[PDB]
């Protein structure tokens, strides 16, 4: 029965170790994602939460009719 149907204890042991490593890395990544999202919401210096402003390519720099502008 052990030779035909059952997995070895060593195989299960190392499979469990691999599973634990993968989910531990995923959990640390999730916590870092939450911290990064909170920081970029708070400060707004990063690539996320960049709400649009007015583009400066629409300004006319030619001389106008009145010098005071």
């Amino acid at each position: 029965i052990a030779r035909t149907f059952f997995d070895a204890p060593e195989k299960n042991y190392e499979r469990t170790m691999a599973i634990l490593q993968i989910e531990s890395e995923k959990a640390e990544l999730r916590l870092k994602e939450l911290e990064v999202r909170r920081l970029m919401r708070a400060k707004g210096d990063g690539p996320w939460f960049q709400y649009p402003t007015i583009d400066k390519a629409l300004i006319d720099h030619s001389p106008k009719a009145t010098p005071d502008n």
Binding site: P63, P67, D68, N69
Partner: protein
């Protein structure tokens, strides 16, 4: 905020050109042809400085 820098009344005193509009319009073309250099210098100074107080002289 700041205090506005304003020239005194002695800096604004000059002998005026006391003629009417039709007098100026009669001789407008010759005035543009003959008095071109100070007029163009004043207008360039006005358009570059963007400030009357810096162009008074």
């Amino acid at each position: 905020p700041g205090i506005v820098e304003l020239p005194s009344l002695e800096d604004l005193k000059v002998q005026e050109v006391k003629v009417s509009s039709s007098v100026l319009k009669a001789a407008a073309h010759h005035y543009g042809a003959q008095c071109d250099k100070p007029n163009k210098e004043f207008m360039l100074c006005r358009w570059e400085e963007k400030d009357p107080r810096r162009c008074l002289e």
